[PDB]
Amino acid sequence: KEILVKLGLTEDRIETLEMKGGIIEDEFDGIRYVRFKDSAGKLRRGTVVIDEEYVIPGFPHIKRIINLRSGIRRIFKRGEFYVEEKVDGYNVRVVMYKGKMLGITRGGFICPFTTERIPDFVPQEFFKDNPNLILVGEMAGPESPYLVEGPPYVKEDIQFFLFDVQEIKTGRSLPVEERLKIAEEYGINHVEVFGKYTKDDVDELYQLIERLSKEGREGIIMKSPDMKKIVKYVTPYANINDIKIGARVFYELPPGYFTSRISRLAFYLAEKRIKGEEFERVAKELGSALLQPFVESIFDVEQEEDIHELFKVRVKRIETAYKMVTHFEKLGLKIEIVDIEEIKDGWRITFKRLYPDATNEIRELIGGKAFVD
Amino acid sequence: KEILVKLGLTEDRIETLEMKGGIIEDEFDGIRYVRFKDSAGKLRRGTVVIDEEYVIPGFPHIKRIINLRSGIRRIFKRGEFYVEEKVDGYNVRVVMYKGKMLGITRGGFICPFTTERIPDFVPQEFFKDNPNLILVGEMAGPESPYLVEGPPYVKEDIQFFLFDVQEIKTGRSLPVEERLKIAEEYGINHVEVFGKYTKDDVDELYQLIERLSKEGREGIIMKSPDMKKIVKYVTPYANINDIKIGARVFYELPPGYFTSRISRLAFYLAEKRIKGEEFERVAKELGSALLQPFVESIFDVEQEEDIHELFKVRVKRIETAYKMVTHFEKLGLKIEIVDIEEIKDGWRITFKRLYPDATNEIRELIGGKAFVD
Ligand SMILES: Nc1ncnc2c1ncn2[C@@H]1O[C@H](COP(=O)(O)OP(=O)(O)NP(=O)(O)O)[C@@H](O)[C@H]1O
Ligand SMILES: Nc1ncnc2c1ncn2[C@@H]1O[C@H](COP(=O)(O)OP(=O)(O)NP(=O)(O)O)[C@@H](O)[C@H]1O
């Protein structure tokens, strides 16, 4: 049926797509849609199609730079660019559909929890005035369904941070200034905007990256005002911390997870020509981030305990918690542990995530398994 | 022609093999042979065939253990096992062919340099007495064509260390005691043999691993006397040092190179329950091993210099140096730099190895390349 709606754009190559990704599904309240698992033609990974008119493009990759002074000079030759806070949460695309506000996560999933929560952060008025518009933003905070951590200054459950506004079908991105007005017009919370800079501002930008890193914050995104040039640069902190987080589940992750972030550290250290004791300090922190969580996980598997973590979320409607478990099932494996209704306007829900692979590999290994490399 | 000689063992699946590995070639002195690049049937990777009678089986993988107390218990339930020095050099298989002594490296390559040198370490008498036998051993030292380092106690160019004796066609391995007698009968230098131990000796084995590690040595191989049970265990030092060596060419190596050895450290640390300051010390050493060479390689590419290393070997016959360059070409890319004839009975030859990939990736990156993860 939506196979015709797809034809309104591409061919029987839709059939070639039916092979392994780019699939059908119903929504938070039974709103059937097609999610592009893999990217075909001009429709990116994570692209959602509800109908010919409502086509929410996938959020593109954002290129990364490893050296800050270059890369900046390379990309923003002599132009001027905005520097925004890169917030560590999860990517959310927000649309209004038949009066319903929707939260589309990166993969192209209409997510129950997000969907339920967006209204708290985005006024309905916006879409009433702007049907043709999508909001893109980071959902971030201590009580998050996905990421373990977030910005240290968000004290209670999730918060929403806008960083893009796009029109539908096209997915074309509105100018920075335009998006900032929207944000202020409608009172939508927005990623911090540190200012407009040039390649000539690399020194004070170093200073910024320094502060953010001392504060345990992710890093920055650089944007041309016409939203055509976009690059990410993460802090030393993000790199070491990502390693600390992931070392606890070492065997749940591809080796590249670790080496990539080792790179990014080396390059930082090279670029700032850090040496002597400051270098030692960083080396030691790389060591501990790699070893301690790993070793603690080993002691754990050894005490016959499982590798797990408990994380919390707040909901309006308890049945959406259950809806999450099913949504998670479309990916990982989580179970409920405690409901504290003792929350105004809802319930704090504690989930449990298990890490079978991490637990099994460590198990076998400490069990004395012999293997080939 | 040798296609019939292969048929004396397998079928027209030899043709299926002709696809991508298991190939023909001539030797150090034009002795044509077939090298098994990939393993088919009962003939392993690196298996050499000179003719139906002379079939040098490939050296098998040696299984690894990551936890010492277990693994030992798992493999040598209550049995008794020999503990040999694991010597960091390169794997060599030695045969006598029509009066010629041959050095077959792991991959199945008749190696000019090794071939030229074996006579210095293995008496001809041996093969005169034992035509049906192969010697397997580690070639190791400061002036090595392959590995960068070796045992710290080998002061001048390469040395040979026996660790297996096998009969031909079968490749069946002789008992430990039998190989030790051979070693002593013919004066072939052998890997240090620390003793016979049981699972009940883990404590003094820990002490051994401790000393070896403080001495910057690889580790140990454990062998049942009938050579049927074989397992490797490397020192903390080997793990950290392997990281230090590889970090300098970080991008020349698969991420797994680094993570695997991070694991092995974690497990060591867990097993010995190392904590407090001793833990800190190891964490710092992991950090420096991962960062400092990397950073120095970055400063280097940046000073427009190339990532390279100079390594030396000694030869009897100068034309075998050239022969090496061609043999290397069958794999990597090396050039000659200096000949010091000023060596009794030959020449000390300085080679140069380049690392294009490491140099190019670092180049682009410090040049500010923007990329996707
Ligand atoms: N101010 C911001 N502007 C744009 N994106 C932001 C901002 N703050 C946080 N982000 C998020 O940071 C993401 C890009 O950073 P990162 O998480 O490293 O990439 P990723 O999620 O791994 N996928 P990709 O960008 O395709 O490599 C975006 O996809 C957003 O979800
Ligand atoms: N005492 C010894 N007994 C057996 N092998 C030894 C000994 N000392 C050194 N070796 C060498 O050490 C190797 C085994 O250790 P390692 O270097 O981890 O193997 P590898 O090169 O990874 N190949 P594989 O064993 O197939 O995984 C053997 O291939 C030998 O070349």
Q: Which residue in this structure is represented by tokens 């050895």? A: B261
CATH of domain B236-307+356-373: 1.20.58.2250
CB pair distance less than 8 Å for B262 and A290: yes
Residue A154, phi then psi, degrees to nearest 5: -85, 105
Amino acid sitting at position A233: Y
d(CA B362, CA A184): 43
Our CA angle for B351, B354, B360, nearest 5°, is: 170
- Which atom of ligand 2 is least distant from the CA of B64? 18
Residue type, B353: R
What distance in Å separates the CA atoms of residue B323 and residue B310, rounded to the nearest whole number? Answer: 18
- Dihedral angle of Cα A101, A105, A110, A113, to the nearest 10 degrees: -70
Give the residue from B59, B10, B8, B56 showing the smallest Cα distance to B34. Answer: B56
State the closest ligand 1 atom to the C-alpha of B372, by its place in the atom list counted from 1: 27
Q: Between A256, A290, A295, which is nearest B255 by CB?
A: A256
Q: Where are the beta strands (DSSP E) in B7-158?
A: 23-25, 33-35, 48-51, 54-56, 63-64, 80-86, 90-97, 100-105, 133-140
Domain parsing of chain B, residue ranges: 1-61, 62-89+192-235, 90-191, 236-307+356-373, 308-355
Give the pair of three-digit tokens for residue A244.
């600390």
Residues B72, B233: Cα–Cα separation, whole Å = 10
Per-window interface: A 162-221 vs B, CB < 8 A: none
Considering only CB atoms, which chain A residues are within 8 Å of B371?
Answer: 63-64
Among A88, A105, A180, A221, the mutation site with the greatest number of ligand 1 atoms within 8 A of its Cβ is A221
Whether B257 contacts B246, CB under 8 Å: yes
- Report how far Cα B310 is from the mean position of its chain's Cα atoms: 19
State whether residue A338 is helix, strand or coil: strand
Question: Helices in chain A by DSSP H: which ranges?
Answer: 2-7, 13-17, 69-75, 112-117, 125-129, 176-186, 202-214, 236-247, 255-271, 276-302, 318-329, 356-366
CA distance B22 to A372: 22
Pairing status of strand B346-354 against strand B334-343: antiparallel
b/e sequence A77-88, b meaning 16+ C-beta within 10 Å: eeeebbbbbbbb
Q: Does domain B90-191 sit in CATH 3.40.50.300?
A: no
Q: Do B65 and A287 touch (CB under 8 A)?
A: no
Task: Give the whole-angstrom CA distance, residue A321 versus residue A348.
Answer: 10
> Hey, which residues does B151 pair with through a beta bridge?
none
Sheet containing strand B48-51, edge to edge, reads B23-25, B33-35, B48-51, B54-56
- What is the count of residue pairs from A and B with beta carbons less than 8 Å apart? 173
Distance, CA of B309 to chain centre? 19
Amino acid at A312: K
User: How close does chain B come to A162, measured CA to CA in Å?
Assistant: 22
Question: Residue A302: its chain B contacts at CB < 8 A?
Answer: 270
CATH class of B1-61: alpha beta
B256 touches chain A (CB under 8 A): yes
CATH architecture assignment, domain B308-355 = 2-Layer Sandwich (3.30)
**How far apart are the CA of B297 and the centre of ligand 1, in A?**
30
- Classify B62-89+192-235 by CATH class: alpha beta
Which one of the ligands is nearest to B221 CA? 2
Q: How far is the CA of B126 from the centre of ligand 1 (A)?
A: 67
Residue nearest atom 23 of ligand 2, based on CA coordinates: B61
- Pairing status of strand B90-97 against strand B100-105: antiparallel
Q: Which of A338, A332, A333 is nearest to A312 (CA)?
A: A338
State which approach was used to obtain the coordinates.
X-ray
Exposure class string for B337-360: b at 16+ Cβ within 10 A, else e: eeeeeeeeebbbbebebebeebbe
Name the region of B187 (left: φ>0; alpha: ψ -120 to 50; beta: rest). Answer: left
Which DSSP symbol is given to A8? T
Nearest to B286 among A67, A74, A287 (CB): A287
- Please state, in angstroms and rounded to a whole number, the distance separating the CA atoms of residues B280 and B159: 37
Neighbours of B241 (CB within 10 A): 21
Site to substitute for ligand 1 among A64, A91, A174, most atoms within 8 A of C-beta: A91
Residue B356 makes CB contacts below 8 A (sequence gap 6+) with B333
- Look at residues B250, B236, B237 and name the one whose alpha carbon lies nearest to residue B294: B250
Ligand 2 binding pocket (C-beta < 6 A) is A 372-373; B 59, 61-62, 84-87, 91, 138, 163, 191, 221, 232
* Torsion angle of C-alpha atoms B277, B282, B287, B293, degrees rounded to 10: 130
Q: At what angle do helices B356-366 and B276-302 cross, to 10 degrees?
A: 80
**Cα separations (Å) of B345 from B28, B318, B340, B348?**
20, 11, 12, 10
Can you give A163-212 as a three-state secondary structure string? EEEEECCCCCECCHHHHHHHHHHHCCCECCEEEEECHHHHHHHHHHHHHH
* Chain Cα centroid distance, residue B296: 27
The residues, ordered by sequence, that sit 6+ positions from A198 with a Cβ below 8 Å of its Cβ are A76, A78, A79, A80, A81
The ligand whose atoms approach the alpha carbon of B371 most closely is 1
Cβ contacts of B70 on chain A, cutoff 8 Å: 366-368
